Amino acid sequence: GPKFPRVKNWELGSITYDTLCAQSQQDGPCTPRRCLGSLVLPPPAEQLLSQARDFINQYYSSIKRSGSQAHEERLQEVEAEVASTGTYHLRESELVFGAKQAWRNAPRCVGRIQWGKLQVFDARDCSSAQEMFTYICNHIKYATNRGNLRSAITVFPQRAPGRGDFRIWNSQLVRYAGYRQQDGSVRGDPANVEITELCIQHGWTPGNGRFDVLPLLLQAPDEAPELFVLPPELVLEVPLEHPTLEWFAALGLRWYALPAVSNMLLEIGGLEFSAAPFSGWYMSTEIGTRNLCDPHRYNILEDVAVCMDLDTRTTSSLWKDKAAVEINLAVLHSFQLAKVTIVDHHAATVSFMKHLDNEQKARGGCPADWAWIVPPISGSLTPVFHQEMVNYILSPAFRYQPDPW
């Protein structure tokens, strides 16, 4: 009947229609000829204005004053500002709304049930790399909260015409070093080889552990990036042990508490925030499956399987599956023991299903990237696997941006 994508849940037999996708102003990578959904990575005053008008409309709607005098005056104010400066500036509450809407709009995030609970730190007054470090340390302190983790974003000054960007060079605020060895292998996190060598080129004295916390490379406008070492007491980590396998603790594994992505671009109303780090808490599979077991990450699956005395000589023993499960259990158990916020992939996907239903009512749909939403272990054991999803780009948005170097 309805001229909108029909979305089915095959577990429950229920049907919805996504009408929200009609609000998408930006094309993705797919066409009627081929679907590129699995691909990881696929102003003129006029363009800015329409984006800005769209956002201001979004803002006034969200506060139920659409069509009002203050709405029309804000529109006039934004246009006039662009008229004389080529850009414009957000009011504080507009920044807060946009930051939250960016998260709410993120198709790849399974944690969006939490989207309304986001502490927005306005750092648009920051004017140095040293000052960025202060703001970041404060973010880490607040967000970590001794293990009772709190979602937060710190927004630094927006991209400005004829002036360099504020950039955090590191992909997350907390990252383990990856040291390339003489034998070609990697000690530490192979994901972080490039940033590690960049840190060294910039005067960092490197360690040689598997879990050396990297220093921050922070870049203020039109300046070389400066190197900042995080005070270790600010960086909460959890040593990994297993509830029953006593040898697991002897592996010396660990992960940091705070997932704090820092290389993403926050776009709101056409304004571009090139440095706006944000953090929540981990879903246990990110650490236990991906970071610890990916072939091109720590790759600990065989080591653990051997300790479990599994038959690693044949696929059909399911040694990989068994080990992966116990590694994930260790992550959950250790985070719980340490009283550091974490969520398993069952609890998380269940809560995302609740989120989908909320957004169905609130907005007529929810953009979602099935491949990213479904967890990397136990896929069909979670409800989201059986849930069809429509993927599309809404704005405000978090966007990938090229590396500053």
Ligand X SMILES: CNCc1cc(OCc2ccc3ccc(N)nc3c2)ccc1Cl
**Two tokens at 75?**
């529109």
Query: Which of Zn ion, its own copies, ligand H4B, none interacts with 301 (beta carbon under 5 to 8 A by kind)?
Result: its own copies
Cα 293 to Cα 172, 204, 376: the distances in Å are: 19, 28, 11
Distance between CA atoms of residues 233 and 257, nearest Å: 12
Distance between CA atoms of residues 270 and 55, nearest Å: 8
Binds ligand HEM (CB under 6 A): choice among 121, 273, 281, 335: 281
Binding mask 386-405 for its own copies (x = CB under 8 A): x-xxxxx-------------
289 and 280 in contact (C-beta within 8 Å)?
Answer: no
Stretches 126-134, 165-173, 197-205, 386-394: which one binds ligand H4B (CB under 6 A)? 386-394
Distance between CA atoms of residues 221 and 145, nearest Å: 31
Residue 382 within binding range of ligand X, rule CB under 6 A:
no
Phi, psi of 23, rounded to the nearest 5 degrees: -80, -5
Q: Is 17 annotated as a binding residue?
A: no
**Two tokens at 52?**
């800005």
> Least distance (Å) from ligand HEM to the CB of residue 104?
9
Binds ligand X (CB under 6 A): choice among 160, 230, 261, 393: 261
> Least distance (Å) from ligand H4B to the CB of residue 261?
12
List alpha helices for 145-271, DSSP H. 193-201
Residues 6+ apart with CB under 8 A from 293: 299, 300, 301, 323, 324, 327
Residue 12 within binding range of Zn ion, rule CB under 5 A:
no
Cα 66 to Cα 59, 296, 345: the distances in Å are: 9, 50, 39
Distance between CA atoms of residues 80 and 403, nearest Å: 33
- The residues annotated with a catalytic role in the active site are 109, 112, 281, 286
Residues 6+ apart with CB under 8 A from 250: none
Provide the 10 A C-beta neighbour count for residue 263. Answer: 19
Binding mask 306-345 for its own copies (x = CB under 8 A): ---------xxxx-xxx-xx--xx--x---x-------x-
Specify the residue, 45 or 193, whose C-beta has the smaller distance to its own copies: 193
Round the CA-based radius of gyration of the chain to a whole number and report it.
23
Question: Chain centroid to CA 82: how far?
Answer: 31
Query: Which of ligand X, ligand H4B, ligand HEM, none interacts with 263 (beta carbon under 5 to 8 A by kind)?
Result: ligand X
Specify the residue, 250 or 371, whose C-beta has the smaller distance to ligand H4B: 371
**Two tokens at 48?**
């800015």
Binding mask 32-61 for Zn ion (x = CB under 5 A): ---x-x------------------------
Binds ligand HEM (CB under 6 A): choice among 49, 95, 110, 136: 110
Binding interface with ligand HEM (CB under 6 A): 103, 106, 108-111, 114, 118, 151, 153, 278, 280-281, 283, 286, 343, 348, 372, 398
Binding site members for heme b: 109, 400
Binding interface with ligand X (CB under 6 A): 111, 171-172, 191, 259, 261, 263, 280, 282-283, 286, 400
